[PDB]
Every structure is written in structure tokens, then in C-alpha cells.
Amino acid sequence: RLFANIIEDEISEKLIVNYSDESIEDMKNHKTYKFTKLIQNFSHQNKDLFKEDLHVYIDFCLKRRENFNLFSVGSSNIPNTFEKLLAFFKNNYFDKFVITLQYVMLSSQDLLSNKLKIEESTISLGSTLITLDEITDKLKKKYSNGIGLSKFQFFCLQDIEPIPIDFYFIEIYQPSIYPILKRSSPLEIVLKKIFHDTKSAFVFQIDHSAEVYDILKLSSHLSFIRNPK
């Protein structure tokens, strides 16, 4: 599942956006890039991606109790994706789930403060844990060097003994990391555990940046990742 967040008024004429076909042709590199969905976005009227196809994706994994992820891949122009994600869960799930968050920068650094193990069922983080309702007006210090790794646990209120459904939100805004992602190193173990044991979805920021061509190339490799079997 590959989404292109098209910053339309900023992209070079060397990239040809085809909404009908959901494709981007790179006239510089003589290569065409296909996606699940192009999202038409603008620099001053900023869309919430969670009111589009992602909503359905998220909702489906939750109802099916399948562990899942979303990758946000971009550059220096950091989208508002993290804050809208928090807002989306507040508005839709607080009544069916107890939801926890742990948030780290990985290379580790705990982004919520005043251990990182691979297990069969989950990735265990030893950083600070909060429930999402603990986020109040008095709480800026976001990842926006390595990767941003958020782990949400959803404990369904309908269950007498809930197995948490894990959701991973992974922020990759450092061009250095694209090769590590492609190859999928400590990061490689994490990344490969996520691609193998959780359903995947990707959003790529397509804008002004000099990395846009590499972001596109990167999407081409990520387009081969399959559902955990």
C-alpha cells in the first residue's frame, strides 16, 4: 500500500503527475512510478491523510486484530502526520480501546521521558509508556538522525483478556536511512521484523526536495513488500 502525498504546487515540472492513473513519471530519470493512491495536497491548504484511504486501512487492521504499521517517508519539510495521527485516534477509538504509546528515535533515545527486544509476537520497547489520554495542552518535543519509531498498543474493550494489537508509526526523514530501508544493522533487524510480522503501508512526501527522485526510487523497492503470511 503505497501512497504519494503530492505537494502539487511545489513539485518540479520534471515530474508528471497522473491522478487518473495514480502514477508519477520521472522525466529526469526516464522511469514511471505507480502507487495505490496519489493524494493531491497543497502547501497552504494542508490535508489530513487519516480522513482518506488510511482510515479504512487502519480500521480494517484493528477489526481484524492484525498487527500493522504506517511508514512516513520524506525530507526536511516535515509533514503534520504525527499530530493528526494522535488526533485521529482521539476522535475514533478512545471509546473502544485503551491505547498506549511509546516513542523513540532509533539508530536509542526516549522521546517521552521527563531496552529493545525482538520477540515472536511483538517488538518490546523499554521506553516511557503513556496512555493517549495523558496527552493534554501541557505536552513540541517530537522527532521532527535515525528513525522515528512509535509503538501504539490497542487493548480492545470487548475482550476479557485483551491481546494488544500493535501499530507502528515509523518516521524516516533522513536521506542517509533510505539505503537501510532499501536493504530491508540494528535498524535492519527492527525494519525486517516489521515488514515480516506486521501489515505495511507507506506514505511518500513528493515535493520540492532534492531527494524526491530517491524517495521515488525507494518506493519502487518497497512496492514488493507482502502481507505477513
Asked if 215 contacts 207 with a C-beta cutoff of 8 angstroms, the reply is no
Q: Is 5 helix (H, G, I), strand (E, B) or coil?
A: strand
Q: Does domain 1-229 have CATH number 3.30.160.20?
A: no
Q: Bridge partners of 7?
A: 41
Render 37-66 in DSSP notation, one character per residue. EEEEE-SSS---GGGTHHHHHHHHHHHTT-
Angle subtended at Cα 86 by Cα 80 and Cα 87, rounded to the nearest 5 degrees: 85
* Residue 13 vs residues 67, 73, 132, 200, 211: alpha-carbon distances, Å: 39, 21, 42, 30, 15
Asked if 17 contacts 63 with a C-beta cutoff of 8 angstroms, the reply is no
Q: For residue 166, which of 183, 155, 152, 146 has the smallest C-alpha distance? A: 152
**Which cell numbers in the block locate residue 218?**
525507494
Instruction: Indicate if the alpha-carbon torsion angle 102, 105, 108, 111 is positive or negative.
Output: negative
Asked if 198 contacts 70 with a C-beta cutoff of 8 angstroms, the reply is no
Angle subtended at Cα 98 by Cα 195 and Cα 171, rounded to the nearest 5 degrees: 35
Asked if 82 contacts 171 with a C-beta cutoff of 8 angstroms, the reply is yes
**Which cell numbers in the block locate residue 158?**
470487548
Q: For residue 49, which of 87, 97, 20, 94 has the smallest C-alpha distance? A: 87
Helical packing angle, 81-92 and 53-63, nearest 10°: 50
**Experiment used for this model:** X-ray
Asked if 217 contacts 211 with a C-beta cutoff of 8 angstroms, the reply is no
* Residue 101 vs residues 48, 59, 66, 127, 155: alpha-carbon distances, Å: 21, 18, 17, 10, 12
Residue 221 sits at φ, ψ, to 5 deg, of -75, -40
Cell numbers 477489526 correspond to what residue? 63
**Counting every residue, how long is the chain?**
229
The whole-angstrom separation of Cα 22 and Cα 38 is 5
Asked if 204 contacts 79 with a C-beta cutoff of 8 angstroms, the reply is no
- CA-derived radius of gyration, the chain: 17
Asked if 201 contacts 3 with a C-beta cutoff of 8 angstroms, the reply is yes
Ranges of each domain in the chain:
1-229
The whole-angstrom separation of Cα 215 and Cα 211 is 6
Q: For residue 148, which of 190, 211, 91 has the smallest C-alpha distance? A: 190
State the resolution, in angstroms.
2.4
The whole-angstrom separation of Cα 174 and Cα 211 is 10
Render 84-153 in DSSP notation, one character per residue. HHHHHHHHHTTTTEEEEEEEEEE--EETT---EEE-SS-EEE-S--EEGGG--S----S----EEEEEEE
